[PDB]
Nucleic acid binder design. Structure first.
Ligand SMILES: [Mg+2]
Length: 755
RNA sequence: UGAGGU
């Protein structure tokens, strides 16, 4: 099965690069006049071949330092600083690549590059310019409100003894990425909110956590606060108005505007910012989401053609070859391996997946469930202001009949309406005896407001004070009839997994696998971190990826990603399993989440040493050490795989296909897995990094296991991208962090409360 | 917050 790999083999010439430093006698840092005067000076000296990267200049040939006064509108310095070969340092190679991509027309936003119209270089011909405009058009969203800039994310990587026919020195990764910006500035948004909200604190709540790009400097930041008592007229030590006039030459319109705060404390003027991504007021708009998804999702044929016509452009290739990087227009020839077909089973029948058919909602709608606890004393909460009595009764009735159809035996609930929708549960917690808090197994909730404060309040209060699981639906999302029945069926699906069982205190199980490649006597561990007070979530599964007994901890330092006491909470669960079953786990697979960018490897080794110390210290488990496997799986990658049929047509790789990365120079064995299926567009794979292994089975079985976990995600009826043990950990972390839980009641920890 | 891929 032939495949193509979006890494172009780049032949890099050992060009001698000279680094020059420039200074300007006047105290001007306008980011545009400095470049202009530098260009004037370079033209005066007549060095056409040059590269400008902020404070340094790249040249192919070393020439002496020239300083001269430029008569404009004034001493321009040149200082030789560095000269090493290009081949040795990938950092340089990336810098020249980025500067060239900036020259050809792209703008460096964050770490990516995005096309534009004004910041362009004239040496490009009109045909090439039109082709680039077509390939990377600035799409308009919402009829003049949102820009959708389409550009490339790039990286230069060294090869690891590549077979081809000669070994290539380096490869280049190219990914087409679309980024959304909003036309309106921050000041307009805050004024609009103040018009209707009329509450500064509520405005801070709505605006906090959002990302914004400043255009005068074009850098991205996160909203950490807003000072309303602070005005541009006030002074700060190096007034903000004078600071912008001198440093950036931008006229200020609002002298009484508040200033947004982004501490490492820096203050930014909202009139010169723009929100990042979809607006919160339109976050879940169906038509808006459909339009953006249509405009950013490229069919595999479309994406492949776009990439091929971009790379095959002889003019851009000449531009890059000038600076020693000869990109090969062809693509890496490659042969992949398809994992064995997987068969899903339930309590009713056995139905293999075979080719495609990677969604099985029909199976769950026409069959029963595996594990489901009887619902006896469950509560139903509906708003009494938006009172629909007979509608509430019929909702209870159809919920009951669907639960009966799903194999989950259910009892009539206690339909109760509240004005407050929050204080009823407070009264419930105040009186255990009257309300029988321990008797309630589940409290279904209906809130019509969708506000993120009430929802967080109910999910935190039901889990920190009572320990009764709840399920939330927005009343508007329920009133319509087109997707009401699917929504209620998915409600049954989530409730099955979200209510504790009486026997083993476990959640429900929806499907299993007929033949799991997961070896017997194995504890699958999935760990993720949500960084905000940052929380690390962990999930252990003694069975072959069926039930997860989650746990959480506070990462010692905010922003840091390293668990201090991983070994303690792992040996605790091993001891619990030994006490329960008098059995010792033969294998322990750790599917930790992260990016192995030379820091996560050290962190993972530190965690491994910590767990080794704890487990050797453990008297019970010292003499028999369970085998350990530390495997990194990654979500945010810019890699893709393209598939070729006999007729030479682009197609998504068949789901479950995988490959071993023999090109990137990494110390550990990497694999690329496409687990899922998407109807439209190329599907982004996942990066299985096998950092540490002691277990007998080869890494191929590990990739197969990860694919199995992918084909076991209970939240989505069909296959998913990230293996369930990792997404579950991420969901644990997101739930604990977002809802500010002080401590989850231990009884619910074994339940799948994160779904 | 019906939910995953985008
Ligand atoms: Mg949910």
């Amino acid at each position: 099965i032939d495949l193509e790999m979006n890494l172009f083999p780049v032949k890099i010439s050992n060009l001698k690069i000279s680094i020059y430093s420039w200074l300007i006698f006047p105290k001007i840092d306008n980011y545009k006049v400095q470049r202009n005067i530098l260009e004037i000076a370079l033209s005066e000296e007549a060095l056409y071949e040059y590269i400008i990267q902020k404070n340094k200049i790249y040249q192919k040939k070393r020439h002496p330092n020239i300083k001269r006064v430029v008569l404009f509108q004034f001493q321009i310095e040149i200082n030789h600083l560095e000269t090493v070969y290009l081949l040795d340092n990938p950092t340089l190679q990336n810098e020249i690549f980025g500067s060239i991509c900036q020259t050809v027309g792209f703008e460096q936003i964050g770490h990516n590059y995005y096309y534009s119209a004004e910041r362009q270089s004239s040496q490009l011909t009109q045909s090439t310019k039109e082709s680039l405009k077509r390939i990377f058009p600035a799409i308009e969203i919402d009829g003049g409100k949102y820009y959708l800039k389409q550009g490339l994310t790039t990286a230069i990587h060294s090869t690891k003894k590549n077979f081809s026919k000669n070994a290539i020195s380096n490869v280049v990764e190219l990914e087409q990425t679309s980024k959304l910006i909003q036309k309106k500035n921050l000041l307009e948004i805050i004024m609009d909110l103040n018009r209707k909200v009329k509450d500064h604190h509520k405005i801070e709540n709505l605006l906090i956590g959002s990302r914004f790009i400043t255009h005068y400097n074009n850098r991205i930041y996160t909203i950490h606060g807003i000072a309303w008592n602070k005005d541009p007229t006030s002074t700060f030590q190096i007034t903000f108005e004078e600071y912008y006039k001198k440093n950036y030459q931008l006229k200020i319109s609002d002298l009484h505007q508040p200033l947004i705060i982004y501490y490492p404390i820096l203050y930014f003027l909202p009139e010169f910012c723009h929100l990042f991504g979809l607006s919160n007021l339109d976050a879940d708009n169906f038509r808006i989401r459909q339009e953006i998804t249509r405009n950013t999702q490229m069919s595999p044929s479309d994406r492949y053609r776009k990439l091929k016509t971009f790379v095959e452009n002889q003019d851009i290739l000449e531009f890059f070859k000038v600076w020693g990087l000869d990109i090969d227009s062809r693509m890496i020839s490659m042969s992949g391996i398809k994992l064995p077909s997987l068969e899903i089973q339930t309590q009713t029948g056995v139905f293999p997946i075979n080719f495609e058919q990677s969604n099985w909602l029909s199976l769950l709608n026409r069959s029963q469930v595996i594990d489901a606890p009887e619902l006896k004393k469950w509560m139903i909460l509906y708003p009494k202001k938006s009172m629909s009595l007979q509608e509430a009764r019929k909702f209870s009735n159809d919920f009951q009949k669907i639960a009966q159809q799903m194999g989950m035996v259910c009892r009539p609930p206690q339909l109760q309406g509240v004005f407050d929708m929050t204080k009823f549960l407070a009264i419930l917690k105040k009186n255990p005896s009257q309300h029988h808090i321990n008797s309630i197994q589940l409290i279904l909730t209906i809130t019509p407001n969708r506000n993120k404060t009430c929802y967080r309040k109910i999910k935190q209060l039901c889990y920190r004070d009572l320990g009764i699981a709840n399920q939330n639906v927005v009343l508007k999302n329920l009133r319509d009839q087109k997707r009401r029945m699917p929504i209620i069926r998915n409600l049954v699906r989530q409730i099955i997994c979200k209510v504790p069982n009486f026997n083993t205190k476990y959640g429900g199980a929806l499907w299993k696998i007929k033949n799991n490649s997961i070896p017997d006597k194995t504890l699958i561990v999935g760990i993720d971190v949500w960084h905000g007070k940052s929380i690390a979530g962990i999930v252990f599964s003694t069975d072959k990826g069926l039930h997860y007994t989650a746990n959480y901890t506070i990462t010692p330092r905010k922003g840091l990603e390293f668990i201090h006491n991983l070994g303690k909470i792992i040996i605790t669960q091993l001891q619990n399993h030994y006490n329960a079953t008098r059995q010792y786990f033969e294998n322990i697979l750790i599917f930790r989440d992260g990016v192995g960018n030379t820091q996560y490897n050290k962190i993972l080794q530190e965690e491994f040493k910590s767990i080794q110390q704890e487990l050797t210290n453990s008297s019970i488990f010292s003499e028999k050490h369970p085998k350990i496997a530390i495997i990194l799986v990654n979500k945010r990658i810019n890699r893709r795989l393209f598939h070729k049929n006999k007729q030479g047509q682009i197609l998504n790789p068949k789901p479950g296909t995988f490959i071993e990365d023999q090109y990137i120079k990494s110390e550990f064995s990497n694999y690329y897995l496409v687990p899922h299926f998407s109807r439209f567009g190329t599907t982004r794979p996942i990066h299985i990094s096998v950092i540490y292994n002691n277990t007998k089975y080869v890494n191929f079985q590990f990739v197969e296991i990860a694919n199995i976990l992918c084909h076991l995600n209970y939240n989505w009826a069909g296959t998913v991208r990230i293996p369930a043990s990792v997404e579950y950990a991420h969901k644990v972390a997101d739930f604990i962090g977002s809802n500010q839980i002080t401590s989850i009641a231990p009884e619910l920890l074994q339940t799948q409360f994160y779904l």
